[PDB]
């Protein structure tokens, strides 16, 4: 290996790739980063067994001789970041050793051969799903958080994504207490699919694909999914199994509706949480009457909250309903609309939230606690 | 019972300052609380963690209606206050040590405790104050605190030795018997002699508590603690008892070699040296000084090697090769504000000194090398 590259540009590509490398690796060799170089550019590869990133730096960069080597990720990344001048010269020598040279500083690191690094799977090469990056990042911010965090039921730790009739896109996540569903009609037909992707993997995707990347190509396989842009390949294992029916849970009718300013209600709920979080399963009680809406929390020997809430509008019947404020807090953080429409059926049935904006088909459900 | 209204932003700032003296975990449970005493002239907030105590007073915006005193869990109380909606908060104590906090349409009631459950402050005489400028005190701290020892095995090394001799010679020194940092100052006005050792962490908190808008502070001494006081802030610190080691006897007479480097570039070079030497426990860097040729070297049998030519400002004296733990030099350089640093070496096995290049301060640091 022999090539010279702009340091800054190199640190960015490396940081992105490092998102796929765990701090602790049960599989030793995976703590390393793969560096491959051919005549057209430098390709970095990191992995932790759940996700894999292949980032390509296209020839800021001039290559002298092709090659491949593995280096301890963090260690190497730290080193590169601390290099003197803007330019850096990478040159491999006998016994898989790399000689980095920048400014008046020269540092040699001992690597290992690529042969011992797991090879990537070949995900189906067919006409992928084309998705706009900001839409996918929007879907992720609205659903990933609703997925359960307990491995008790693995399937629920991911976001269920399904394409029907070659055009009806659905993304749903749930934890048996709250649910989030985003529906979208693609502008172009495409092959049907149905997968469950780890929430953690989706979060990384948003961190990896910067907003300068307009669209990504999506490819599917039974155990793995690939998100691909011009120079970045993001792989992730899928959660195998059957994701429960969720359409059945969609509340059709309601008895009460209240529209709130999203931000103001979130703050009131965060206020309630500070007190309710004092006990396990602590809840907030919402009292809805005509032109009077209040939140109440009572934590014996700790404190209590009594707060009157402002609303935009309301309809239907009066109602008193209790629930864990954290679910509502998180649901509101996911709603970018200035207002939020909340639909209730009764004190013991789930209530649903939709953006007052009506800019998208975004529905959330939260299950109340009976008192 | 307590009753006052206060500006939310003002309250939060004062609370977060006091919270600096309140530990996350507490062996003595009651120390997790913040003590609030309301008097005719202001609201005084007190926090302590067994090492330091902070009494911060908000002077009478703030409107006080009735006097009182109460204890509330600090972190919890502050998060609540910070979460209130309106610009102003009304605080009203009711029966059974409870306070009703009202801000806008939000009413939050909290359960508290009687102040008699809180330990009393070990008072310190307010007579014959030593007056020091805040920026000067903060400068001394940032230059010596880091050199103290963390090892509890020997308490005294954990603090910074501060001594005033001949009523005018001020000395602040700290060491980990590996490296040392010393600051000498001559007072313009004579003041009573003193000699104490202050826990280094307690000094770092001083800098965080007294904001720069505060020109000076009054310093009072007692055998067990020292009190730093501004107009509205009283900061107490427990003192480390014992005989501090004779550190004057460590200053090096002459030097055989001297080199002047750009403070920052040398720090950057040493940081790279650390990235490799750190791989090997007790890892060290090797400095090779010869006529117009200075270079750093590190060789880790596993991860890699370091060969770096060091740019210099000026040199003089004999050639020399010396090895030392880089982290020590890195930290010494971080403490030097001047563009350049002057390094004086003796033998490969003798401590080498560092002093600011602009020579505006009598700031000397000593670093013990490693016998290669």
Author numbering:
A (entry chain B): 2 to 60, 66 to 377
B (entry chain A): 1 to 60, 66 to 377
Text from the published report:
Sliding DNA clamps are processivity factors that are required for efficient DNA replication. The β subunit of the holoenzyme is required for efficient processivity in bacteria. This protein factor wraps around double-stranded DNA at primer-template junctions, where it serves as a sliding clamp to tether the polymerase enzyme to its DNA substrate. Here we present the crystal structure of the β subunit of DNA polymerase III from Streptococcus pyogenes, a Gram-positive bacterium.
The crystal structure of the β subunit from Streptococcus pyogenes was determined by multiple anomalous diffraction (MAD) at 2.6 Å resolution using datasets for three separate wavelengths close to the selenium absorption edge. A model built into the phased electron density maps was refined subsequently to 2.1 Å resolution against native data. These crystals (space group P21) contain one β dimer in the asymmetric unit. Consistent with the structure of the E. coli β clamp, the S. pyogenes clamp dimer is formed in a head-to-tail fashion. Interestingly, the S. pyogenes β clamp dimer has a distorted oval shape, unlike the more circular shape of the E. coli β clamp. The longer of the outer oval diameters is ~90 Å while the shortest diameter across the clamp is ~65 Å. The overall organization of the S. pyogenes β subunit is very similar to that of the E. coli β subunit, with three distinct domains in each protomer. The interior of the central hole in the S. pyogenes clamp is lined with basic residues, many of which (e.g., Arg 8, Lys 25, Lys 143, Lys 206, Arg 272, and Lys 342) are conserved between the S. pyogenes and the E. coli proteins. In the closed form of the S. pyogenes β clamp, helix α1" displays an even larger displacement from ideal geometry in comparison to the E. coli β clamp. This distortion of the interface in the S. pyogenes clamp is correlated with the presence of the sidechain of Phe 81, which pushes against helix α1".
